[PDB]
Amino acid sequence: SMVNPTVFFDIAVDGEPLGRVSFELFADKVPKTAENFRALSTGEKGFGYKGSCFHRIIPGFMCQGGDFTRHNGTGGKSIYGEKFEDENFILKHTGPGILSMANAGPNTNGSQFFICTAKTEWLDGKHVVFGKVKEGMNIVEAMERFGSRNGKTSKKITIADCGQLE
Amino acid sequence: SMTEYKLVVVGACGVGKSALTIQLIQNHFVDEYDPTIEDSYRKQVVIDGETCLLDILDTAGQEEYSAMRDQYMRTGEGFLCVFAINNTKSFEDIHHYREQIKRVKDSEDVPMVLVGNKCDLPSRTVDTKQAQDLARSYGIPFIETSAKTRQGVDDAFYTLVREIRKHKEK
Ligand SMILES: Nc1nc2c(ncn2[C@@H]2O[C@H](COP(=O)(O)OP(=O)(O)NP(=O)(O)O)[C@@H](O)[C@H]2O)c(=O)[nH]1
Ligand SMILES: [Cl-]
Ligand SMILES: [Mg+2]
């Protein structure tokens, strides 16, 4: 992209390399939300995603991660404080690869996010969409296979490294 | 002989539905919150001399996905309706859960128990009289529980089975 930043996650399965997933972050349309995810991916504020887990993976739906504070699916924090408001609902959950914010209701964005593996249109207007997988959707499909119906993963899926691409 | 009962645990997020279920099934409590998607458990017990299999569906507190939640209620024979005694909104939410159950099952008389959980805590916002009056208005039992100390846990589930058995006599 000439305008939108690209970040990457190197995914691991019980510490073994699985592959790299890269994301286009839609700073052109969702700047505050995209900047949060960018900065948490570089770690430049002194905290962020590196080392954290995809704790909830449900085949047919999504891979959810991003809790680097409680490390158990309940936590998270943004670069703006513990939570920030829903920025806009311009973009919708149109299919696999969509990157969107997890939340606990209105205006509770922190750091948790999910990657859709199917269209999830019932989340439109409730979760802020701010990016999409650029490369490595096959790695996301591989992660999805470690999930289960209640989200528990059969092996521990982590962000072994992450950062911003030039 | 034995019988089998489909019990469904419902109520707002964080009130202790899972902690109550895990105490019944696994006889332990942890402070760590593990938010539910959906879990099912089975346990053989004896209640009032009569052996039965409990099939317990532990539901998430959320109320989207009406298609799935309606199916929970269609299949369920009795409902634990849980609130937390230090969470007034969770008590106010009880009415909605009960209305949904009555609608889905096409009945004003569905086996249910009102459960006021976390009674070990010093931060009460819902007093016992409030809950007893609400349960009285529904014609259902009220049981105060603590998943942490295990107070009332067996009573809540066993009372629900008693309620199902009374309903089946009608
Ligand atoms: N002190 C105290 N804490 C309790 C009690 N029951 C549950 N908790 C705590 O309350 C939190 C939420 O409990 P949990 O059983 O997961 O709630 P839930 O109703 O299943 N939540 P969800 O709707 O997300 O599935 C946990 O931290 C748990 O340890 C109780 O009786 N006493
Ligand atoms: Cl949801
Ligand atoms: Mg639960």
Question: Domains in chain B, please, with CATH?
Answer: 3-169 (3.40.50.300)
Inspect the interface and report whether the beta carbons of A150 and B35 lie closer than 8 Å.
no
- What the block records as the tokens of B40 is 């099912």
Residue A134 near residue A23 (C-beta atoms within 8 A):
yes
Where do we find the tokens 């004896």? B46
Q: Is A157 on the interface with B (CB under 8 A)?
A: no
How far is Cα B142 from Cα A53, in angstroms, rounded to an integer?
40
Neighbours of A66 (CB within 10 A): 25
**Structural resolution in Å:** 1.5
Backbone angles phi, psi at A157, to 5 degrees: -105, 120
- The string of DSSP codes covering B30-63 is -SS----SEEEEEEEEEETTEEEEEEEEEE-S--
Question: Domains in chain A, please, with CATH?
Answer: 6-165 (2.40.100.10)
**Which among A139, A116, A138, A136 is positioned nearest to A18, based on CA atoms?**
A139
Structural element, H or E, at residue B9: strand B3-11
- Provide the pairing of β-strand B112-117 with B78-84: parallel
How far is Cα B16 from Cα B13, in angstroms, rounded to an integer?
8
- What the block records as the tokens of B57 is 């569906």
Q: Please classify residue B64 by burial: count the beta carbons closer than 10 Å to its beta carbon, then call 0-12 exposed, 13-18 middle and 19+ buried.
A: exposed
Residue B96: helix, strand or coil by DSSP? helix
How far is Cα B25 from Cα B142, in angstroms, rounded to an integer?
21
Give the type of residue at B135. Answer: A
How far is Cα B155 from Cα A63, in angstroms, rounded to an integer?
39
The number of CA neighbours under 13 Å toward the Cβ of B2 is 11
Which of A56, A74, A150 shows the shortest C-beta gap to B38?
A150
| Closest residue, chain A, to B40 (C-alpha) | A150
Q: Which residue is catalytic, options A18, A36, A38, A56?
A: A56
Sign of the alpha-carbon torsion through B157, B151, B9, B105: positive
Residue A149 near residue A56 (C-beta atoms within 8 A):
no
Contacts of B66 (CB under 8 A, 6+ apart): none
Burial A98-123 (b: 16+ CB within 10 A, else e): bbbbbbeeeebbbbbbbbbbeebeeb
